[PDB]
Design a protein around this ligand. Structure first.
Ligand SMILES: NS(=O)(=O)c1ccc(Cl)s1
Length: 282
């Protein structure tokens, strides 16, 4: 069923809440035993958001390999994403270790450091060229190289140096800065513009490791980003784009990380972004 028609049918009936709860009811449940170990309690921002053991990213150290991050592997679309929480004060060095080990080209950030008067994630990147950051626990150095500030997003060029080997890489930081404190954007136009800027960078392409995507918990806004990207990709690859079922794509993605898409408004916004995205590159 064409999703544009499904959309109008749900909207006229006002059944967004009932669709969303059907997804929650059918979603996968897998063990998260590593996330719940007592040694990892300060590595988790939220007690009810954990990575599944089967899909978690492992850090390459013998001490403690744990980070709140999951590999989402979409077999038919041929895309991979790492979804993670906003870094904590004691996990900033783990975060950049993961970026290094997984060979990511891009970091996608969908939240502000402060929202609703509370801290949603640590200030994990340098704000001035001449004041670099050193993460002593993971032996990495991070330098701001360039800054391009637009109305809806900022793009930063960063230099990450493995102080052990003195190799350096260029990491692109894509920061979406205008998601509202409550609800979802009214129009998906600026979110779709942002997605096509990430695509054009090469950050989503198979010659790099997976893109690292985060918001505060790494399930809501982060979920919307990878659901829209994957749905638009399959609509271009398939002989019938009307065969793309966004609810089935979301349940496939929820096999790899719990809770992706946090509200019925985020589910409706996802339909909108895909509906408009397709209708712009049509
Ligand atoms: N300073 S620059 O030549 O623009 C530069 C680009 C990429 C880096 Cl990493 S450093």
């Amino acid at each position: 069923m064409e999703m544009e028609k499904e959309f109008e049918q749900i909207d006229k009936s006002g059944s967004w809440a009932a669709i969303y709860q059907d997804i929650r009811h059918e979603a996968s449940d897998f063990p998260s035993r590593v996330a719940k170990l007592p040694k990892n309690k300060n590595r988790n921002r939220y007690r009810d958001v954990s990575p599944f053991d089967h899909s978690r990213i492992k850090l390459h150290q013998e001490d403690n390999d744990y980070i709140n991050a999951s590999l989402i592997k979409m077999e038919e679309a041929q895309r991979s994403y790492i979804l993670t929480q906003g870094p904590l004060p004691n996990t900033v060095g783990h975060f950049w270790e993961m970026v290094w080990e997984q060979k990511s080209r891009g970091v996608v950030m969908l939240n502000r450091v402060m929202e609703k008067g509370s801290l949603k994630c640590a200030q994990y990147w340098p704000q001035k060229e001449e004041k670099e950051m050193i993460f002593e626990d993971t032996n990495l150095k991070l330098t701001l190289i360039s800054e391009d500030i637009k109305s809806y997003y900022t793009v930063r060029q960063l230099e990450l140096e493995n102080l052990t080997t003195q190799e350096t890489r260029e990491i692109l930081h894509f920061h979406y800065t205008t998601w509202p404190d409550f609800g979802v954007p009214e129009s998906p136009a600026s979110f779709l513009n942002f997605l096509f800027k990430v695509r054009e960078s090469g950050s989503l392409s198979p010659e790099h490791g997976p893109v690292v995507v985060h918001c505060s918990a790494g399930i809501g806004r982060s979920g919307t980003f990878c659901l829209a990207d994957t749905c638009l990709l399959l609509m271009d690859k398939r002989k019938d784009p009307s065969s793309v079922d966004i609810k089935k794509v979301l349940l496939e993605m929820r096999k790899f990380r719990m809770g992706l898409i946090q509200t019925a408004d985020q589910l409706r916004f996802s339909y909108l972004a895909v509906i408009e995205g397709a209708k712009f590159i049509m």
